[PDB]
Amino acid sequence: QLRYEKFFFTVKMTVRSNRPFRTYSDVAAAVSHWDHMYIGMAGKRPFYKILAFLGSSNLKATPAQPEYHAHCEGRAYLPHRMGKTPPMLNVPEHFRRPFNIGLYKGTVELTMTIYDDESLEAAPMIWDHFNSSKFSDFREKALMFGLIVEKKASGAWVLDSVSH
């Protein structure tokens, strides 16, 4: 049941916090609120989770109240075992929710797009966009977003399933 979904993706993220996050763990805890009362395309949720995770890894504090931004775009393959994925249309969805994780509270705003790519031309593995994927603990970080990843034979991470 192992598959490789090829897709185009765009993720625009803005995180607003009362104070600067001290660790990536804080950033992940906040960004993972993006799909609280989720009403987006069910079939796309696993992928959006990945994109939110990716965006969170590339958030940068706006030059010179703290605000963070990330914008990531491209094509990639995703190895997973969630079964055949329903067709994915190029229809942008928006997710704007609040978060309160202790010392930090604010909001996360994500506009994402993901739709099937048939280009059949060389496309990198989504995981390769994650610098943190080169370590075994990438597992723990992915789980912060409700993602269960595992590395099969010959390395390479595979999205086994969503935790919920």
Coordinates of C-alpha atoms in Angstrom, one line a residue:
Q1 CA 0.0 0.0 0.0
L2 CA 3.1 2.2 -0.3
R3 CA 2.5 5.2 -2.7
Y4 CA 4.2 8.3 -4.1
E5 CA 1.8 11.2 -4.6
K6 CA 3.3 13.9 -6.8
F7 CA 1.9 17.4 -6.3
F8 CA 2.4 21.1 -6.6
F9 CA 2.3 23.0 -3.3
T10 CA 2.2 26.5 -2.0
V11 CA 2.2 27.5 1.7
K12 CA 1.9 31.1 3.0
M13 CA 2.2 31.4 6.8
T14 CA 1.9 34.2 9.3
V15 CA 2.4 33.6 13.0
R16 CA 1.6 36.3 15.6
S17 CA 2.8 35.9 19.2
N18 CA 2.8 37.9 22.4
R19 CA 6.5 37.0 22.7
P20 CA 9.3 35.5 20.6
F21 CA 9.4 31.7 20.7
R22 CA 12.5 30.4 22.4
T23 CA 12.6 27.0 20.8
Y24 CA 11.4 25.3 17.6
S25 CA 9.2 23.1 19.8
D26 CA 7.3 26.2 20.8
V27 CA 6.9 27.1 17.1
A28 CA 5.6 23.6 16.3
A29 CA 3.2 23.6 19.2
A30 CA 1.7 26.9 17.9
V31 CA 1.6 26.1 14.2
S32 CA -0.1 22.8 14.9
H33 CA -3.2 24.7 15.9
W34 CA -3.8 25.4 12.2
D35 CA -6.2 22.6 11.8
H36 CA -8.2 23.0 15.1
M37 CA -11.9 22.8 14.1
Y38 CA -10.9 21.6 10.6
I39 CA -13.3 21.9 7.8
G40 CA -11.0 21.8 4.8
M41 CA -10.8 19.0 2.3
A42 CA -10.6 15.8 4.3
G43 CA -8.4 14.0 1.7
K44 CA -5.9 16.9 1.8
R45 CA -5.5 17.1 5.5
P46 CA -2.5 14.8 5.7
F47 CA -0.7 16.8 3.1
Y48 CA -1.7 20.2 4.6
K49 CA -0.2 18.9 7.9
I50 CA 3.1 18.3 6.1
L51 CA 3.0 21.8 4.5
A52 CA 2.3 23.4 7.9
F53 CA 5.2 21.4 9.3
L54 CA 7.4 22.6 6.5
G55 CA 6.3 26.2 6.8
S56 CA 7.0 26.1 10.5
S57 CA 10.5 25.0 9.9
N58 CA 11.1 28.0 7.7
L59 CA 9.5 30.7 9.8
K60 CA 11.4 34.0 10.0
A61 CA 10.8 36.9 12.4
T62 CA 9.8 40.0 10.5
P63 CA 12.7 42.4 10.3
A64 CA 12.5 45.1 13.1
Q65 CA 4.2 42.3 18.5
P66 CA 6.5 39.5 17.3
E67 CA 5.4 38.3 13.8
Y68 CA 6.8 35.4 11.7
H69 CA 6.4 34.6 8.0
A70 CA 7.1 31.7 5.7
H71 CA 6.3 31.2 2.1
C72 CA 7.3 28.0 0.3
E73 CA 6.4 26.8 -3.2
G74 CA 7.3 23.9 -5.5
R75 CA 6.6 20.3 -6.6
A76 CA 7.4 17.2 -4.7
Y77 CA 6.6 13.5 -4.0
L78 CA 5.3 12.1 -0.8
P79 CA 5.8 8.5 0.2
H80 CA 2.9 7.3 2.3
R81 CA 0.6 4.3 3.2
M82 CA -2.8 6.1 3.5
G83 CA -4.3 4.5 0.4
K84 CA -5.3 6.1 -2.9
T85 CA -5.7 9.8 -2.6
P86 CA -8.8 11.5 -4.1
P87 CA -8.0 13.9 -6.9
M88 CA -6.7 17.2 -5.6
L89 CA -7.8 20.4 -7.3
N90 CA -6.0 23.7 -7.4
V91 CA -8.3 25.4 -4.9
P92 CA -6.6 27.4 -2.1
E93 CA -7.8 26.9 1.4
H94 CA -7.3 29.1 4.4
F95 CA -6.8 28.3 8.1
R96 CA -6.7 31.0 10.7
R97 CA -6.8 29.9 14.4
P98 CA -5.6 31.1 17.8
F99 CA -3.1 29.2 20.1
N100 CA -2.2 29.4 23.8
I101 CA 0.6 27.1 24.8
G102 CA 1.8 28.6 28.0
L103 CA 4.3 31.4 27.7
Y104 CA 3.1 32.0 24.2
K105 CA -0.3 32.8 22.8
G106 CA -1.4 34.4 19.5
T107 CA -2.6 33.2 16.1
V108 CA -1.5 31.2 13.1
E109 CA -2.7 32.1 9.6
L110 CA -2.1 29.6 6.8
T111 CA -3.1 29.9 3.2
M112 CA -2.2 26.5 1.4
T113 CA -2.7 25.0 -2.0
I114 CA -2.0 21.4 -3.1
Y115 CA -3.0 19.8 -6.3
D116 CA -1.9 16.8 -8.4
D117 CA 1.2 17.0 -10.5
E118 CA 1.5 14.9 -13.6
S119 CA 4.5 16.6 -15.0
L120 CA 6.3 13.2 -14.6
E121 CA 9.5 15.3 -14.5
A122 CA 12.0 14.9 -11.7
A123 CA 10.5 16.2 -8.5
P124 CA 12.3 16.1 -5.1
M125 CA 11.0 14.2 -2.1
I126 CA 9.0 16.5 0.2
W127 CA 11.1 15.3 3.1
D128 CA 14.3 16.7 1.5
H129 CA 13.0 20.3 2.1
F130 CA 13.3 19.5 5.9
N131 CA 16.8 19.9 7.2
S132 CA 15.6 18.2 10.3
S133 CA 14.7 15.0 8.4
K134 CA 18.3 13.8 8.6
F135 CA 17.8 12.8 12.3
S136 CA 15.8 10.0 13.9
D137 CA 14.0 12.6 16.1
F138 CA 12.3 14.0 13.0
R139 CA 9.7 11.4 14.1
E140 CA 8.9 13.4 17.3
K141 CA 8.6 16.7 15.4
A142 CA 6.3 15.2 12.8
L143 CA 4.1 13.8 15.6
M144 CA 3.7 17.3 16.9
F145 CA 1.6 17.9 13.8
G146 CA -0.3 14.6 14.1
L147 CA 1.9 12.8 11.5
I148 CA 3.3 9.3 12.0
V149 CA 6.4 9.0 9.9
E150 CA 8.9 6.1 9.7
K151 CA 12.0 5.4 7.7
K152 CA 11.7 2.2 5.6
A153 CA 14.5 0.4 3.7
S154 CA 17.2 2.6 2.2
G155 CA 16.4 5.5 4.5
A156 CA 13.7 7.8 3.1
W157 CA 10.8 8.8 5.4
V158 CA 7.3 7.4 4.7
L159 CA 4.1 9.0 6.0
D160 CA 2.6 5.9 7.5
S161 CA -0.6 7.8 8.6
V162 CA -2.2 10.6 10.6
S163 CA -2.4 10.0 14.3
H164 CA -6.1 10.9 14.3

